[PDB]
Amino acid sequence: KNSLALSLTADQMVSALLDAEPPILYSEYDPTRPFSEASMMGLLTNLADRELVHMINWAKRVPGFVDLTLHDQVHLLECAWLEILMIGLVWRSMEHPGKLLFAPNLLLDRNQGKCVEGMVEIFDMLLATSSRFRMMNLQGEEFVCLKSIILLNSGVYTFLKDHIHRVLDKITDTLIHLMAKAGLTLQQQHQRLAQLLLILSHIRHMSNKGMEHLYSMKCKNVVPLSDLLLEMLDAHRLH
């Protein structure tokens, strides 16, 4: 009736999150023939589908997650999957100003985004988010915490329990610890925590726009979607 996650120290939380990191995957992107709406969507959804497989492995390695029942785990992933992909992407694109690092062999800049009408405004937000992490010096230890928050948090209020909020608190505790260790003043700690948590609101926004765009692509037969992706979309419901 417990969780070995609730008695982890800060350090142990950071360690277990850093090692749980998924690998960077490559795009099967063939640079010997042009970008088209279909073909870019094809490369992106393909990459999303394979990143997905690793995301699930990773989630089972977030402290306190596998303590949830499957039906909860399912709901959380279903609910967070795109936010997680997005924040990963933004992290990878940090020290590449103006560009999105979908894969080491897939750097796309805002204008490439126009290749798929309806996409460029999502690229725009993703790039805005990259600048903000960049100019606030986001660290990897903070990144992996934010990412774990999005997982446990983004689906917790549509469970219509306290153990998920217990673990969320222990991550808050870890974030502060990291800031104090980096020598931030007490009030610099609480300011920075708020600045990081406030960005999650905007990532949530991007996810909703991204979900509606992907749905549009589907309902216009621009690209096929792996049955896995199709089930992620279906968890959400669009017009």
């Binding site: 089972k60 785990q73 399912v74 992933l77 896995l228 089930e231």
Partner: peptide, 9 residues
Amino acid sequence: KILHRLLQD
């Protein structure tokens, strides 16, 4: 549910 399967594999 493919997700359900992947979650326990």
